[PDB]
Each structure stands twice: as C-alpha cells, then as structure tokens.
Amino acid sequence: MATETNYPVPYRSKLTEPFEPGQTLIIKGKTAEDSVRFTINLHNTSADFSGNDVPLHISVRFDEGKIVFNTFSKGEWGKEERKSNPYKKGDDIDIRIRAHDSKFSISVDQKEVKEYEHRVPLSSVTHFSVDGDILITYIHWGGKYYPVPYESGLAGDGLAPGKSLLIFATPEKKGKRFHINLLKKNGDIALHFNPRFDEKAIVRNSLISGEWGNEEREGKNPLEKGIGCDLEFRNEEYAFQIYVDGERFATYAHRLDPHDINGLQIGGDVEVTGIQMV
C-alpha cells in the first residue's frame, strides 16, 4: 500500500459504454522497491459477477522482468505472449491501451511495444480492473479516431484562465512538423504551437488580423517522432503555461485578451488520440 487517496486497488470500473476502436485506456501509477507484479484487465461481466471472459489480460512482472499478455475465455487461458518489462522495482509506470478493429495497441512510457490481435470480441469488454503491487495515480478512458486536419469549437466558455486544454497525440514517425491553434471567434490565433523536428524547435506565435507576430522558440523540443506525448495548454492570467509530458516546456505571454478562446485547429504530421478540457 501507500496512501488511500484515488483509485485504491483492487480497482474495478464498469464502463459507461463498450470499449470501441479509437479509444484509449491510460493507466499511470507508482511501484515500490518490493513490488513484485500488478495486472491490468479488460473484463467481461454484468455488474459485479466477474470471472467470465478476459479479452485482454496484462501482467507486468518485476520478478520475471516481463510484460505478459493473454486472453481468458470459455473457462480457459490461451497461449501467453511476452515483451520485456522496461521497469525496475520502484519508479513510475505508464501503460496505455488503444483499441482498434483488429487488435489492441499497447504503449509503455508512450512507446508502442505490443500489438495484440483480438482473440475474442472487443465488444465483450464491459469492465476494466487494476490490481497488485501498484499505487494508481491516473486512469482515463476515452478519445476516438480524431481526423487531422482537425477543427472544432471549445465548449461555451472555451479555454479561459483557470482552465486547460489537454491533447494526447503522437508525432508521425516520418513527420516533419505539425501545429495546434487556439483561436478567437474572428479567426485570430491566440496561440500557435508548432513543433518543427527539422529545425529542432517548437515555434510559438500569434496570428492577429492576418499577421504573424514575433515568434518564440528556444526550448530544445522534448517531443520525438513516433513517441506519444501529453500536451497541456494551461491558460493563466498572464500567460499560457505549456506543459509537455508533465514538465513545463514554455510560458507564452498573452498577446490577445484571454477569455473567449473558443476555437481549436490541429494540423500537420501528427496523430491525435485524445482531446479534453479540464
């Protein structure tokens, strides 16, 4: 154990609606120097029964030093498939499971490590559970296949100080660049976030009355082609606090009045797997 707090294990959650292609289940947590193993299961059952089908069973083993995947159905287990466990007892874990129509794609530390073909119906997944030697710190399931170029409005209040836009994406393996625009009602871009792997920098700028501003770079670019990332545009009183994978990558002084940031555009060489306003 460690602390009661959020998601105490054994953790069990009954999905609102079945798990569908395009959706991702994100599980983050902490382990101890004596942690031996923990499991993540996509379960089948009514409400509390359990013990039925397990379309996908994931076992992270610190003793064996492996992450083992399998399926349980019709009262029996199939043949296990293994990958190396990159984690040592202690240090945090970050495992994400994205469903597709023919397989589950599992990433560890945002790096794709396994493609597990469906052995039983994905639609039979009605619950998911986490248990074992792990202290869960974050769980989230959602997203969809976001078409890119992407464009949509932001709530009614939009992105305002005190709020943050969370975007989960993966820069394309052979991508050169992509961008994310936070816009105003008239088309002006309050913030243009533009990673350029060719120039090894992330350009930040504003588009006011059809004109691009100064342009702020400097940072080193913490993004990498083919690796998943968590972008957070934390809107504050005096500036946007741009967080990349949990670390503050940059601050961007507001050039346009905050408030009323009602638009979002995403384009370029990137795959988007999650968008949320928190």
Ligand X SMILES: CC(=O)N[C@H]1[C@H](O[C@H]2[C@@H](O)[C@@H](CO)O[C@@H](O[C@H]3[C@H](O)[C@@H](O)[C@H](O)O[C@@H]3CO)[C@@H]2O)O[C@H](CO)[C@@H](O)[C@@H]1O[C@@H]1O[C@H](CO)[C@H](O)[C@H](O)[C@H]1O
Dist CA 27 CA 38 (whole Å):
12
Q: How far is the CB of 205 from ligand X (least distance, A)?
A: 5
* Cβ proximity to ligand X, 86 vs 268, nearer residue: 268
Q: How far is the CB of 121 from ligand X (least distance, A)?
A: 44
* Cβ proximity to ligand X, 38 vs 178, nearer residue: 178
Q: Does residue 123 sit in helix, strand or coil?
A: helix
Burial pattern 240-275, b for ≥16 Cβ within 10 A else e, equals bbbbbbeeebbebebbbebebbbbbbbebbbbbbbb
* Cβ proximity to ligand X, 117 vs 215, nearer residue: 215
**Using CB under 6 A as the criterion, what x/- string covers residues 179-218 for binding ligand X?**
-------------x-x--------x-x------x--x---
Q: Which of 41, 36, 30 is nearest to 2 (CA)?
A: 30
- Chain residue whose CB lies nearest ligand X: 203
Taking a C-beta distance cutoff of 8 angstroms, is the pair 239, 252 a contact? yes
Number of residues located near ligand X, criterion CB under 6 A: 6
Tokens, residue 178: 């992509």
Q: Does residue 40 sit in helix, strand or coil?
A: strand
Q: How far is the CB of 212 from ligand X (least distance, A)?
A: 4
Residues 213-242 that bind ligand X (CB under 6 A): 215
For binding to ligand X (CB under 6 A), which residues are involved?
192, 194, 203, 205, 212, 215
